[PDB]
């Protein structure tokens, strides 16, 4: 062996931290191959490999490695390690759609954190439980009681998280709680409360110079103001989102903000502006081969052109809408 288990694992850690989980996995898998009798080290390798696979969207392997970690953490009596493995299992189960199992795992992380008087772990588990319940609520077709109950549970967990990270003075974590809390209120139809939460999210984003969080807050504020009937205000927030979005490598962000602006201007009965924004979304949806998006663009454009009496363009987009609609039949 030219490198030891520990040496290989350390390189994997660094590669993953650097954003190259693919390369990191190779080093962790090399480390597991070499092996070690140090069970704490082995559990750390499994945990890191589980997270790397999670980030590479191999959720089955993520689950396998987080389970291997859980097994070892229990056998050596590493309570913190068991809590972490359980939280990781929960978050993996969440993405797989196994929400009720995710709840148990994430609650286990919470329970052990409390047993250990680990408030940082406790807070993180509360955030995770809010996230599981939020996604659970959406899985039931977001007004059905199963949706309302899960989303309300999400509010409760996010509020408990926010209290604890306020006690811990973790301002960036407060910002994250506010964002997810706001979007949960939004789904529940509590639009004023969504505005209150996203306003805090935005203030916190600005305190940190966090341009991504700022952009998210603008987008979510726009969304909430649409449902409050405040279309002009929504347009102002969506324009602020778009100013940032148009600079991003991920073109979907600009596309969505343009679609939203298109709809806002339709609601304001400014059909010329609506068309401008909808044409931008159409171009990007085509670039990204998003046929559902392209179809929705053609519908929105046809509606707007019709309102202006531009039947030549409206009918161009009717044809394309019909074509795409059959394709996505």
């Amino acid at each position: 062996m030219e490198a030891s288990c520990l040496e290989l694992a350390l390189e994997g850690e660094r590669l993953c931290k650097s954003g190259d989980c693919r390369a990191g996995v190779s080093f962790f898998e090399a480390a597991v191959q070499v092996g070690t009798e140090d069970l704490k080290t082995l559990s750390a390798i499994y945990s890191q490999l589980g997270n790397a696979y999670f980030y590479l969207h191999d959720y089955a392997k993520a689950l396998e490695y987080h389970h291997h970690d859980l097994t070892l953490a229990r056998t050596i009596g590493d309570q913190l390690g068991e809590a972490k493995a359980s939280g990781n299992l929960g978050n993996t189960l969440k993405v797989l759609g196994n929400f009720d199992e995710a709840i148990v795992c994430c609650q286990r992380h919470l329970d052990i954190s409390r047993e250990l008087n680990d408030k940082v772990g406790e807070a993180r588990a509360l955030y995770n439980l809010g996230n599981v319940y939020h996604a659970k609520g959406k899985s039931f077709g977001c007004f059905p009681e199963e949706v309302r109950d899960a989303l309300q549970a999400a509010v409760d967990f996010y509020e408990e998280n926010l209290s604890l990270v306020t006690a811990l003075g973790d301002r960036a974590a407060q910002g994250r709680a506010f964002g997810n809390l706001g979007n949960t209120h939004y789904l529940l139809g509590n639009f004023r409360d969504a505005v209150i939460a996203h306003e805090q999210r935005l203030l916190i984003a600005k305190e940190f110079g966090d341009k991504a969080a700022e952009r998210r807050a603008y987008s979510n504020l726009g969304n909430a103001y649409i449902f409050l009937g405040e279309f002009e205000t929504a347009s102002e927030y969506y324009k602020k989102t778009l100013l940032l979005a148009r600079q991003l490598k991920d073109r979907a962000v600009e596309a969505q903000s343009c679609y939203s602006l298109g709809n806002t201007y339709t609601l304001l009965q400014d059909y010329e502006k609506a068309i401008d924004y909808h044409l931008k979304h159409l171009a990007i949806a085509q670039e990204l081969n998003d046929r559902i998006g392209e179809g929705r663009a053609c519908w929105s454009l046809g509606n707007a052109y019709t309102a202006l009496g531009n039947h030549d363009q409206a009918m161009h987009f009717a044809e394309k809408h019909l074509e795409i609609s059959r394709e996505v039949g």
């Binding site: 520990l6 080290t41 945990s47 772990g121 979007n183 979510n220 649409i226 969505q256």
Partner: peptide, 26 residues
Amino acid sequence: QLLHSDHMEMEPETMETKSVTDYFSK
């Protein structure tokens, strides 16, 4: 008249992390 999109911007998610650099922990 309108087809509203289902997009909203959720916050970053976490995982719990371990490191072999915790070798000397009790």
